[model samples]
Target: QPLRKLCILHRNPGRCYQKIPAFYYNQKKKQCEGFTWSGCGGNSNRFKTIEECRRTCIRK
Candidate 1:
């Protein structure tokens, strides 16, 4: 099956002061990558872990 549009979105670190560890799917790499999220203003592509990101976005 094809991936969702949410799965193809670029990582948006958001704009804030708090630096929290996060993960997002990379369309080019076709894998979940680690990133830093501001805990606000980011898109739904954000996840707390790589496993969660892959489970939600990667094809089985």
Candidate 2:
């Protein structure tokens, strides 16, 4: 299925969620000396730190 960019997240065809959607880690890149998600989506982009990313996922 073809993926489309929706917000910071990529929307995969044939996938749906009743609550918080499940998304795969599409891509990652280093910026300066930190990690960044350029072609990724979900809570990963919303949160800066790994701890925060975990918190966001837990809340979902």
Candidate 3:
């Protein structure tokens, strides 16, 4: 089976956000939101949204 991408709450919008789309919980939104991952420096908060990202970050 494919390895699961752990919850990495990272963000760097300007850079090369990798193919692995991720999600982060928006405290303001009170729900999960989606964004591309740069696989680099950022906040490091990706969890379980965007389906997989949500399951890891936001909870799907």
Candidate 4:
């Protein structure tokens, strides 16, 4: 799922330790930052790194 740009919060791929680090945009930080999901409740945002998410959600 490398090319799969978006990564929603709490969208754990099961084997979290073996999975790619996911990120989400922070209104305060004003950029995308990584998160740690526990395969539990969902929040709001997610996607690539600051660069990727910026290029993605920004363009669209």
Order the candidates by lDDT, highest first: 1, 3, 4, 2
The best candidate by lDDT is 1
**What tens digits encode model 2's per-residue C-alpha lDDT throughout 1-60?**
112232234223232333333333224522111233333333333334434343333332
Clashes of each: 0, 0, 18, 0
The deviation in Å at residue 44 for candidate 4 is 5.6
lDDT of 4 by residue, 1-60 (tens): 332234333233353354445776554665666765445344435564667775654443
Off by over 4 Å in 3: 1-14, 50-60
TM-score for each model: 0.73, 0.25, 0.47, 0.44
| Candidate 3 per-residue C-alpha lDDT over 39-60 given as tens digits, one digit per residue, 9 for 90 to 100 | 5556555644445544545543
Candidate 2 — which pairs collide?
none
lDDT of 1 at 48: 86
Of 3 and 4, the candidate ahead on TM-score is 3
Model 4, residue 50: C-alpha shift (Å): 2.1
Ten-residue stretch with the least lDDT total in model 3: 1-10
Consecutive 10-residue window with the lowest summed lDDT within model 4: 1-10
Error of 1 at 28 (Å): 1.9
